[PDB]
Amino acid sequence: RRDWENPGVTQLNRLAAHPPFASWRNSEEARTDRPSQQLRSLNGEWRFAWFPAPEAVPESWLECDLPEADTVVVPSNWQMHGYDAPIYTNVTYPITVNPPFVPTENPTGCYSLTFNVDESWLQEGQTRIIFDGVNSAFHLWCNGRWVGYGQDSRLPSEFDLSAFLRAGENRLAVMVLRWSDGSYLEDQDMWRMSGIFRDVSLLHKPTTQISDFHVATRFNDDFSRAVLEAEVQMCGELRDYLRVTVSLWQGETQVASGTAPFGGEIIDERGGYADRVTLRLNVENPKLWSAEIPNLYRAVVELHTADGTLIEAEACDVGFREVRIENGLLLLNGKPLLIRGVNRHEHHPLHGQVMDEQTMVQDILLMKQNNFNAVRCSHYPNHPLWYTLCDRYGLYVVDEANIETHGMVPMNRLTDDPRWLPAMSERVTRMVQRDRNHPSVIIWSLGNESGHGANHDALYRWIKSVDPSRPVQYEGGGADTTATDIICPMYARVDEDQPFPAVPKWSIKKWLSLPGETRPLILCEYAHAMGNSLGGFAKYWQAFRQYPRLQGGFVWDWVDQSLIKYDENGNPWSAYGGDFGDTPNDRQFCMNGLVFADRTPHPALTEAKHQQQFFQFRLSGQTIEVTSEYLFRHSDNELLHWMVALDGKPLASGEVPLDVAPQGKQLIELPELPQPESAGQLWLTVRVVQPNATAWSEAGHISAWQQWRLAENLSVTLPAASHAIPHLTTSEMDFCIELGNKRWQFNRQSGFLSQMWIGDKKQLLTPLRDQFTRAPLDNDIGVSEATRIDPNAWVERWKAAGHYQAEAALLQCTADTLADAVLITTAHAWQHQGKTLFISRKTYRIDGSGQMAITVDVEVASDTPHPARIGLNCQLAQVAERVNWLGLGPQENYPDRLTAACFDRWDLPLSDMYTPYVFPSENGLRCGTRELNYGPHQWRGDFQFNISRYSQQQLMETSHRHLLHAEEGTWLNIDGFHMGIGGDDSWSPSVSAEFQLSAGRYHYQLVWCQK
């Protein structure tokens, strides 16, 4: 019997799912969550062996471990230890598509462990083992005797060893298989790893047990009186003297309690459950749970005798909140939620999908500090400690069943087949039974991207029938089917319609106005942050804040899924798909997160933080209108810090405390702002600073900022008459301008600024030319390979039009000396296969004061695709440690993503100017720059600049950031106009028409001088 090639069998001798168990023998130990000696952790040093097929495993392994077997740690994935190559794939399966059969060459991992068992465990009670996660299917042996079989990978597998364990030395043999019939429901977008990647533990229970416990909460309209209903189940013998006490505690103070003998209310015609008891606990003025104030209660259930002797005590964390939908609005505690969620994948920086507490808490801190209040357990149930930490820290959780069939044709091939209904039934109902007692879990989910079948909606309202206290959503079928209470499309744009056949992704504003539609809309996946991405986030959040039924969304995703490889010298470097020999693979589509693998924040995280602030600001005259977006908390740990700056120079500042009601409005009256007579721009910047340190933030954390533009003083002064006039010399091939120490050189053959001389030091390695092309971004490439070309991609449109191949042709190049200047006129044209794409006419004015002025006027054809850039390109010959610029910053920004950047004077090292994207592309651009200083050079005007040690060409050719090499000198690209980056999705052109360089005629001015 090949049980891994049969969907009809998913378990053998497996115990039922339940909330998580510790088997305390003392109520005080259960109350404070001290560790229980009845619960042993089997994580540690295990014996591992690898085989290319399950049939290749010798039967001598069942008796004793092989001498050739190595020793690994548990939990771990054997792919990271060299036994196999991990495969990543987005859509196509890593195996042949022939369900339910897997290929014969099935990688097999044989785990072995020897240990000791106390004799008190064998004398009484039941001893069970828990496998929190095994990818994918496994067979279990105890002392050479077969125990059971498991199939699910993200839910615990429990087996009984009471009749199998022996006193003294005991050996457990586990045969893990990489592929199984359940792997056809595991087509999620991650590195396809395998092994025992979660905790293994032993649990001991008495003869009469606590089988399961359900916790539910019921409120009134004012949320001042709450009823705590506790359903209690037992396994074992039925005696009259067994009693149950459910006690609620806040800190060390008991709130409510109740004792009832076993026996339930009459449900049907001849009685009810005799092994189930009901407890109704009354709480007066409870502290409601929320993402802002995570108020928690400790409920300790205990199974004891009428004399008071305790048999077993179980505890859980209880949060008093309700999630319900009326009038098409998702309400939590009576208030409409605004979800600031983000998709999260279990990806350890070093251990693959082996998840620990440290990285969990670091993730929660980084998410809460960046104004995220929700998380989507995508696309699988998570490690149960994650939900506990979400209770402790206050994050909303969307629990999702581990179901994805993205590789069938069509999408609903398996999900409409009734033969696969038992598999997804045991994959949904067990997770519902496990994580139903967590108040952080507020929305259930059936899975991601599996089409619409009858089994899906059947499970959806099975969850509605069993757990009515939580809404449940589903994507597949067009996000408008009967299997969802919340409209949840993938990457639906704010305004532009994309009508695909039979699954149309309408714009969310138009979607909510569809005939007969009433459900609220929360995006399960939107704003693809793949590399240099996340443009138009401001449009999404303006739509969310304007519309009452637009309740936010989940950004895909949090962390890049990149694995660490080593070079010939042992230096680590992040790797993506195809770097391990796996074929096929979607090449870098595993890096879509807002942070790196080592939890280093991307520049997009700052924009995501700014667009999700809980405080909104409006400047009217001299008053500031502060609007709070908090739903349940009062502003008690915030103060408003304003500052008025004239061109980066501070003039006035101060601190005002904040007192705003939840969803309230407060007026701040600023003192008399200073009125300067000097030229410049007055910028008013306000910040909300938290003085005290919370459980997720440190003292001085900034949560919101906003900056405006005050009264301006335009410069009407005139430069002084320079006593020295520039000397112009005409050569047969060259134009040279002298000012004494300063010398410029223009090449008449190329028509560009050839060289510049300060004393005897040359300043440029390549001549100052134009640049209408950037390194292609991840959103810019799309899903196009070298083998398969996508004509809709921007980069393919540019290289088909010859933007990357056009050669500059010199049309005119004249020089003439003026009264207090030397004037240079040039005019070029870029032609590809006889078609003129761009025409630029420059005017270099060399003043006697030393400043040299560049006026660029560019004509762009529109039949060719719109250029990504209109600007200048040069390579400086001097490498400076510090770079000064006055403008938006200090982080990387773009024309569609600049709302988070602040206009000020910024000083940064040159290494911080280049952000280290794993796939090299256009990066480091800073918009709204009025002045730029680098070494002895100063640039003034209105431009977008980026500065690095790497040329654009090297960023195009090189595919790994570790293969990039610093070039001689310093590369600089000053751009008068830049095209937005998009970010709605990474497979279609997502750049809005307002951010495309499509005017046709462009003009910008530059001033070059030495400071």
Next chain:
Amino acid sequence: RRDWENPGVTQLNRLAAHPPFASWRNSEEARTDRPSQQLRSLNGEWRFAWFPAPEAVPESWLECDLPEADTVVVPSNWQMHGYDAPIYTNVTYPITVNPPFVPTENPTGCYSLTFNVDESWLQEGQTRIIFDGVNSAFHLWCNGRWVGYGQDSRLPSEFDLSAFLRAGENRLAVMVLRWSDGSYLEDQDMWRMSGIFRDVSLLHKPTTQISDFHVATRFNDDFSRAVLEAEVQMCGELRDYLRVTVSLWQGETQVASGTAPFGGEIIDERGGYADRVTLRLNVENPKLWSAEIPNLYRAVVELHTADGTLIEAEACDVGFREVRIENGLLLLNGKPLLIRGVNRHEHHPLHGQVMDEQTMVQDILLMKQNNFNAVRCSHYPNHPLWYTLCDRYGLYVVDEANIETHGMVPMNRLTDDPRWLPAMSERVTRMVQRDRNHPSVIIWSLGNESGHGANHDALYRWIKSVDPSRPVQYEGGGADTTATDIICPMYARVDEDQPFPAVPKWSIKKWLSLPGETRPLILCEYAHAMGNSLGGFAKYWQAFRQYPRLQGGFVWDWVDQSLIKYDENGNPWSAYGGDFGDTPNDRQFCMNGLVFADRTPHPALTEAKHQQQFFQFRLSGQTIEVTSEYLFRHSDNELLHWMVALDGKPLASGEVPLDVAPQGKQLIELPELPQPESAGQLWLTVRVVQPNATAWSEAGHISAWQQWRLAENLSVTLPAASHAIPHLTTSEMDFCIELGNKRWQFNRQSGFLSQMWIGDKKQLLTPLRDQFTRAPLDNDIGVSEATRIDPNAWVERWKAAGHYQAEAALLQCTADTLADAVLITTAHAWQHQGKTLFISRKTYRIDGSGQMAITVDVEVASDTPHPARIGLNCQLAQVAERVNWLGLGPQENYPDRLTAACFDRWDLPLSDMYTPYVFPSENGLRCGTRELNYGPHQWRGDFQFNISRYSQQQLMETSHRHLLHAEEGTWLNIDGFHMGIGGDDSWSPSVSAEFQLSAGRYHYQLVWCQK
């Protein structure tokens, strides 16, 4: 691996369910449903062996059959061959309640068969075997090699033997198990039998096959244009030249056709089913299917090449009808249905649950001739030929999944457990996939009486999702849950409320008026016809006809489930529970049907026929208002036959043809009715006679009748003065009255009529006394045993009050001779433990003409339970072949069930006076009797009489009808007043207060004379 003790496994290597297959290789053979040579029937002589446990089976049986094995026929149940004792139980399980474990002593039946296979079947294509039904679980071997495992009992099990069959002699080994984990879902109310009780067949298909075909019909509001949507699936290789033609035929004429190459519409984001094709056939003016006019079409699907070479053709019967619910009304073809259904169990008269075509057609004929238009496949899917015959003859079918958990505590113990969801999922979805193409199937059902769990409603709207064309109902949970579209209670009374805790059975009129209720009400089980039962059917059908949302119900049930046993001399006799040594057992609760085991109609079937007529009559003056209840047919095969009778003597008669529109109204004007001057009553009787013979009725069949009461002539004449006066002689202990040839004798010690003499012949064996007690009926006993007493039962109330034990005490007995009479006065009292229950005072008047008059005046206490009878008891000494009576008849009737009986002069043999109920009770009563003639005796007055050869006492003591012995002479019980029998249920007092003898004082007169 014990697969029969595991709910997680229900099948191994079992093919998917589908509509029924024949694998024709010619479209003409498929069109007319000729037998296909590709489909072989394996029914015949099989080798059988019995074992007390599966572990006791030797492994030599896998190679060759045992020499000690006997030879039985297939399909058959081994319980009927003496290998085991069949167990019947209503509620309690036949095994211990410990799911999913069955007892170790598991009866096992090993079936073996040797046969030959043509070599053409092995060279190409796939050969599969079909097991239409095996009770309960079985393991299959082919040529000593294990093939698969099955668990379901009422759905086909299909396995592949293409890699297992060999040329020449082949042996199939089947090991059937009586109990399995699936048997916990088989707690239906039948004799728990076991074996291969349905057909076994071999089917051969090509390499490229027709996997499944869905047929759906869509109409407009006027039902004049219909769209035929055919979904076609394939298994095998995908080639471009495969084409599908769906052809619709009416008789030999083609109606519509369509040819399309394989490939479906785009359903999801990257395409649709490439192995599925869609055909839309347009039909102009289709003939709609209904229970009245079963118009059928033959749809032949064929899989052929583009050149026209046919590979495989499959055919099915298609009926153009729609079932839908709007405004709380169940509509078929736009008209509100009035269901006249009846519950039916697969119970063969001789072979248990081995069902053949002959008894199926006989059942359909008997049901249609008795005005039944629907059947409930209770509580399991049926043999697929039954649905085909329901299409052919026109019966509505309510298909029910084989699920019942009546033995758990509580009822929803398993159905709310998610671990059992795969089992009932494969038990529901497979039956949906199998019987979805039958137009007779109009309502789906989840099962019967299993409480309310989440899995139930999950499957309910799984059926809604997969098959929206049919409503689906469910009982459990109080018949008001979210798992049903039709309110379907068990045995809910018309008016009286029975509020059980948490599952209340409200009266249907009050139920429909509940707040927030909108669904229509169709009783899934009502009017328990257990033995002498079915009282108050007129009230039920008056409620059905008066209320628009009361759409009828299903009578439980059709046929008694009684097994044939043999006595010491070999005479067959029907037996009930406990007669085979089975313990426990509900003693005769398996006989609830309207017909006997041999399809002999009960007297209740006549009442069920009369209350379900499609023609309603109303007499106003001299006109007759005929109202048709047909929804789609015109009255073209009916004529109205009226007859006017004066005290059984016909005066005028004639025939009028009927011309009534469907749900129409017609006026019949009767000629001048005769006006007699003679005393008597004028009764007008009308009958609807079908002149032509339909497919279900013979020429002259009567479908409806109704009889009224016309003008009366009261008798004012006086008897002539008798010349002879009766002589009265007074003795010390006796009163003797002489009239010459006639002599009467009254015993002064007992106070009763001692003897009567005609010439020298004695006429009575026991003296004429009172009788206030009847033999207890099945509804009267209830659920009370000798071990367990139910104080609410009528018989227990009577025997606790001493009604069966009261002794008559003589109070007064006086005699006096009148001028032309001799007057006898007596007065008695029945006392039990010092409490007087009944007091009767009679007045015997002996006239000189020969008639003797009896006037009875009875005082009844009301603190004692109301008596079942107030009348006279005597045993005649003469046995007459013929009995004449003028009154209601000729069938058995009762005070609550007399609407079907007709007032006329009836002549019947004495053997037809006693109906042969298997459990003896009160039977043969005829109400409304004005004159009764038996031998030389004549009784006149107003009384209810029954006459038999068996005393009431013998009917009480004897429990089997075959143990009854004819007593000497003839027993006669004349009753002035009789108590109704009830019939709403057989476990609670169902007698209405208007049919209970509760007035307190009763009077009736009798006239005894010799004709």
